Design a protein around this ligand. Structure first.
Ligand code: FMN
Ligand code: FMN
Ligand code: ORI
Ligand code: ORI
Lengths: 210, 210
């Protein structure tokens, strides 16, 4: 079993609530499954090319039947890094995402990553009734840290990072997801240590059944 | 009246449905208001620093009362570009956003831009009840091109780019927003030219009342 620990937080577990909980999850998971492989992809230190003019030009050449050496050097670098991320993602069995909420969504690089990993003919296909995911046997967990409280009730509607992420995962065929919120720390700063420990405990229990 | 024409499409108006419509909007608007100032911000050719470890470090120094010279060179470059985008945004009266839908949301750089423009003590402030916008007298238009149809009905729930963008605009105090969809071109490729022309006409009419 290959697990991708995909983090999108510029701070480490020492200064991020989400990273604290994600590291507790991952450690507890490793203890339960010593032989599982866990690769960390820190999206703040991984090349995750945005789709841009170079990418569209590259895709146009591939659609014209041309090969990799038809691309410029910059195009090659971007497509190579995109293929690497896609292949790493398709071949793993389990995905753990760690994100903070910034302005009602995730850091931009999460979107860039989803744009690398959602690819026609690789992770979804077109059908009569509409697009369907190609990925089978997968499971995901999203750990999201938020100042406010969005996990249930009316404010769930503006939890765009959570909801978009779950949507894209489902679209690509990963319909088995879990969610842990580390929430309310900014609404209640004196309760922040308790909120974190309760989320740590929740992550540790989930690690024994994920 | 100062208008920002903010585009997030790597293609020009000749190869993008959204850009075709946005161009038609913006030229019709200039022609109606020749004395208005219209600045184009192409997000694919504008420095829009992601919030990262350098930015958090820089902010920590400003919160400690230190000045700009306490930053490293890279930090200075990032914060200078972030302040420029923020200032340019705060001082304009109107925003026009052009985006395509990629995997149920916008290109990553739209999120990076919103993370530049949503800043505590500048575009929103903390309140008893919760945060509120500081910007007054502003108006926005979002033009979004999408393969499917999401503008109304059940699929509206997965129009995350539209909905998140509106949410952040509202949050910073821009509650007056218009929306034009250029939609269904991929669902109905034979109707694509008609869909584009109808959206062009809708944009030209809106320009007379925006
Ligand atoms: C740039 C930025 C934007 C934020 N935006 C929101 C927000 O929209 N809603 C919210 O409840 N909290 C927001 N917060 C507070 C964070 O979600 C909260 O501090 C969270 O714990 C950060 O995740 P982390 O501790 O794992 O780094 C924001 C914080 C920062 C630094
Ligand atoms: C990378 C990529 C992702 C896309 N994702 C979606 C999608 O999630 N839903 C949809 O209906 N159309 C999707 N489309 C189709 C585009 O939204 C459609 O082509 C639209 O015309 C793009 O805007 P533009 O013509 O202004 O560039 C996608 C296209 C691309 C290239
Ligand atoms: O639970 S609360 O109602 O108190 C609540 C707390 C935070 C909240 N959002 N706060 C932020 C919004 C946007 C930002 O760029 C922030 C940056 C730092 C801290 C909070 C926020 C909304 C509601
Ligand atoms: O209106 S439809 O039901 O036919 C419909 C059409 C397209 C659609 N989404 N298509 C894409 C999704 C994700 C991508 O990365 C794409 C890339 C190119 C073209 C379409 C899509 C969803 C519904």
């Amino acid at each position: 079993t290959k697990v991708l620990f995909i983090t999108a937080n510029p701070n480490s577990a020492e200064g991020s609530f989400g990273m604290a909980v994600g590291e507790a999850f991952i450690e507890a998971y490793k203890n339960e499954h010593p032989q599982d492989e866990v690769v960390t992809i820190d999206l703040f230190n991984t090349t995750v090319p945005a789709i841009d003019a170079d990418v569209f030009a590259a895709w146009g050449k591939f659609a014209a039947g041309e090969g990799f050496e038809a691309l410029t050097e910059v195009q090659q670098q971007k497509v190579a890094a995109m293929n690497t991320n896609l292949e790493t993602f398709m071949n793993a069995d389990r995905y753990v995402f760690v994100t903070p909420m910034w302005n009602f969504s995730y850091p931009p690089v999460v979107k860039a990553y989803l744009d690398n990993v959602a690819i026609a003919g690789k992770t979804f296909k077109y059908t009569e009734n509409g697009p369907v995911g190609l990925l089978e046997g997968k499971k995901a967990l999203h750990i999201q840290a938020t100042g406010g409280v969005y996990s249930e009730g009316a404010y769930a509607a503006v939890d765009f990072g959570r909801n978009h992420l779950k949507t894209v995962l489902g679209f690509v065929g990963v319909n088995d997801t879990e969610y842990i919120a580390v929430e309310g720390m900014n609404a209640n700063p004196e309760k922040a240590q308790e909120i974190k420990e309760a989320a740590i405990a929740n992550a540790r229990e989930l690690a024994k059944r994920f």
